[PDB]
Design a protein around this ligand. Structure first.
Ligand SMILES: [Mg+2]
Ligand SMILES: [Mg+2]
Ligand SMILES: [Mg+2]
Ligand SMILES: [Mg+2]
Ligand SMILES: [Mg+2]
Ligand SMILES: [Zn+2]
Ligand SMILES: [Zn+2]
Lengths: 33, 49, 100, 36, 67, 183
RNA sequence: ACGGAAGGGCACCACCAGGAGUGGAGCCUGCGGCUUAAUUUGACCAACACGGGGAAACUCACCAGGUCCAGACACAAUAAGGAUUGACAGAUUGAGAGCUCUUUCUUGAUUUUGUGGGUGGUGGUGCAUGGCCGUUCUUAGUUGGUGGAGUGAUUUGUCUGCUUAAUUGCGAUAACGAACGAGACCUUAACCUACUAAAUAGUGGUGCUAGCAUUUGCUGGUUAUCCACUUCUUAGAGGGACUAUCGGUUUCAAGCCGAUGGAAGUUUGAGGCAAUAACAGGUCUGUGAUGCCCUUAGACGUUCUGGGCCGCACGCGCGCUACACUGACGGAGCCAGCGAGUCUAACCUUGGCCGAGAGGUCUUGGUAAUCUUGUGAAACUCCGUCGUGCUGGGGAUAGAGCAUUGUAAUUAUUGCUCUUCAACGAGGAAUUCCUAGUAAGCGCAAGUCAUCAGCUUGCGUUGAUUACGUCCCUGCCCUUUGUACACACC
């Protein structure tokens, strides 16, 4: 549940489904198809 | 694990490169002394005199 | 009628004056009463800094300034003639706040 | 160097959020639960 | 010093080579017509042009000048 | 305040500029107004890309749900070319020729760094008419400095584009020293 | 390109003529040297109050010690009677630190183990870089088209002369015609009794008027008290200066110098932008910028305690106090400017009350031409004490006490009070800055900030001397010249 909470907050950093942009310290995350 | 850092050089960091040195604490920029002079056009700071 | 005071602040003089004159004219053909636009002194936000990203070379400093300026106009109008002129000024770069 | 011994095949207190599984360890005067 | 560059001399000479039955030797009445016979992008540059035309046609009565 | 507020607004425009430069690079980003070279990869799957982008910017800046000739684009494009593999001189020639033939009155592309592993000289490619120090450089010059990161070192690209002052359509229309006579 | 070759020219980073000095004493800072556990590191005109470096924690990369995974991920030897995390009570240690040991409690497919791969590093290389800056350069140089000289590379144009700040021009002339730089341009500081508009500026006049004084005169406040206006102020558009006019000087003129007017006659003053390019100049200690090397769970990463950058036989530079009678000390006059100042919250502080002082307390004004602020600043000026002495200049050093800032003031952070009052009697060879609101004297605002100026960036106030030039000193530019250099005198 400790990861289910964030994975349902969404709608892991390396497996996929994640684009990481830094842009002054704010770790811009987005999902992929 | 963390002692209080609400003031001093370590309290605030540069919003651009996380540098604790050369920070300009003026007008609410919080941008380092090189980063601001680099990205001065995007804030509107320009040279005329 | 309700009394309002609009304040216009911006960095770009051309569009700031376009707004400051558009509001005056569009009150004019609608026949309102207003005291002329008061021109508060321009604030130069001079920021001194070091040209060198380090401490080598002759001591040379770099001075920036972001000239910001501002005008205010007070008048009276009903709510329709306030909102229909408040929604005219959408020019990017000039911010206007209306106090009642 | 925490070991966490295997604890091979083998009551309750206040703060009822614990589900009756906080059996104390009988060393001495041990009326204090593991949580606290 | 007070030396006039090519951007002044060439423009003054170009004005004079086609505007002799035209602007007189008074700077005030030279600049006003330079306003509409030249698309000068600067007031002080226009004033320089008018002043050098004034000098040139002030001396032109003492003999022709080259160029 | 208002002074601090507008300074923060300029900083906010700075984060938008840099974030779109880093994120929208592959789609031809030019400048925050979004101004992109092509506006179909912006829309993506009929709004998915724009929806996720606006969601990210809103969540970052704490907002509610609803609240060709540019040197920057040319530099990004040629950075992409040099990164995917192309002769540096050929890419600079192509960019310079495109800029100069597309109505621009002058271009300069400067490549500094280790082109081939060496003492890292800096080679220029200049074509047309070029202006330097004075208010005209602010009026009509577009400049872009980008860092290419290939397998060896860093390559610094400086691109300068001059739009034609005659077609200024705003501000001065000729050079300060430009004089035109009619008779 | 270079030369320990020559000629012209330029410059208060050179001088002549000068002013302020500095080097002479003390203190503050930086560097060196020394010392240390570290006294971190980089830098030697163009380093040495520089890395906006005024370091108690952090900053910090240095040291004496102690924790943390913040080791992603397809991946294998670990699983559904248990892969792992967490722990108060005691030894441990600075630690209420489950960091380690007695120790048995909790949760349950995250983690942890062995291989692979990432990650960070203020770890190294500025002689691997990008970028940025500094220097050449507070210098004026650079290049096509056509034509001309050569077989040619190339050369003229781009110059003997004069002028300029300028390759700025005039002029001469196989050159003409131009292009970038300079100039032009832009910002600001000067003025405009003019256009426009102002309870966020001011002035006139009425009540609301207290005083002086009463023939209505002076001065004051009347923050919802009244109208008018822009002379003061503000800022948009424009104007004005263009060495204007006139003389002398000019080779032929560019130009120069005088006098007049002008608001302003040195590019009107000061600046921003500053081309062709070159440095192994500096910066990997800004970047989640980066190549390479090193390290990565006994970590050069991160985090906590403490220490360190400050440390002292000695030299040097940036600065202050002065070394007194133009001074020192008491009172009194209250005369600026550029800015800055808090709504998720603690900033700029006015006004009362307390205290000798710093400072505290109750609020108020201020998100600002609105309140601090009219920054009631200093130097300065009036009247008095001191009367030429190591004196009453000087405040170094040290002792005692009170508070603010700060989790934490000891190696005094800082502020204040009292108290022995040290060198210095104007400075050595030398050496730095500078030509008019300039130097110098003075303090103010901001930056560095929780606090701390002697620092720097801007400002204003008082405000001179001498010069209106030269290449003798230094450095640079151009031309000529020599080269056996071409990676170019490393
Ligand atoms: Mg210029
Ligand atoms: Mg470290
Ligand atoms: Mg030549
Ligand atoms: Mg130090
Ligand atoms: Mg300092
Ligand atoms: Zn930064
Ligand atoms: Zn429990």
């Amino acid at each position: 549940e400790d990861r289910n909470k964030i994975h349902q907050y969404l709608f892991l950093t390396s497996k996929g489904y994640v684009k990481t942009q830094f842009s002054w310290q704010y770790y811009y995350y987005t999902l992929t198809e | 694990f963390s002692h209080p850092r609400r003031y001093g050089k370590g309290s605030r960091q540069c919003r651009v490169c996380s540098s604790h040195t050369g920070l300009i604490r003026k007008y609410g920029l919080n941008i380092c002394r090189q980063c601001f002079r680099e990205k001065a056009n995007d804030i509107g700071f320009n040279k005329f005199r | 009628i309700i009394k309002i005071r609009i304040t216009l602040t911006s960095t770009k003089v051309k569009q700031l004056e376009n707004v400051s004159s558009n509001i005056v004219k569009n009150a004019e053909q609608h026949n309102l009463v207003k005291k002329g636009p008061v021109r508060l002194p321009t604030k130069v936000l001079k920021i001194s800094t070091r040209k060198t990203p380090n401490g080598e070379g002759s001591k040379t400093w770099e001075t920036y300034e972001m000239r910001i300026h501002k005008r205010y106009i007070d008048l009276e109008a009903p709510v329709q003639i306030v909102k229909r002129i408040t929604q005219i000024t959408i020019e990017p770069g000039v911010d206007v706040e209306v106090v009642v | 160097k925490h070991k966490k011994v295997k604890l091979a095949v083998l009551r309750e207190c206040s703060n009822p959020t614990c589900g009756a599984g906080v059996f104390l360890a009988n060393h001495k005067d041990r009326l204090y639960c593991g949580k606290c | 010093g007070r030396v006039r560059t090519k951007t002044v001399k060439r423009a003054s000479k170009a004005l004079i080579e086609r505007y002799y039955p035209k602007l007189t030797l008074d700077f005030q009445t030279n600049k006003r017509l330079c306003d509409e016979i030249a698309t000068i992008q600067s007031k002080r540059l226009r004033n320089k042009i008018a002043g050098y035309t004034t000098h040139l046609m002030k001396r032109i009565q003492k003999g022709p000048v080259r160029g | 305040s208002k002074k601090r507020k507008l300074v923060a607004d300029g900083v906010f425009y700075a984060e938008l500029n840099e974030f779109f430069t880093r994120e929208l690079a592959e789609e031809g980003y030019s400048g925050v107004e979004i101004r992109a070279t092509r506006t179909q990869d912006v829309l993506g799957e009929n709004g998915r890309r724009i929806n996720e982008l606006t969601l990210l910017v809103q969540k970052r800046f704490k907002y509610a749900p609803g609240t060709g000739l540019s040197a920057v684009a040319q530099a990004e494009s040629m950075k992409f070319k040099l990164l995917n593999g192309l002769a540096i001189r050929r890419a600079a020639y192509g960019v310079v020729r495109y800029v100069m033939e597309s109505g621009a009155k002058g271009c300069e592309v400067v490549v500094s760094g280790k082109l081939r592993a060496a003492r890292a000289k800096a080679m220029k490619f200049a074509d047309g008419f070029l202006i330097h120090s004075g208010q005209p450089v602010n009026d009509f010059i577009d400049t872009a400095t980008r860092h290419v990161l290939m397998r060896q070192g860093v390559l610094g690209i400086k691109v300068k584009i001059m739009r034609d002052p005659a077609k200024s359509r705003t501000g001065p229309k000729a050079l300060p020293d430009a004089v035109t006579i009619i008779e």
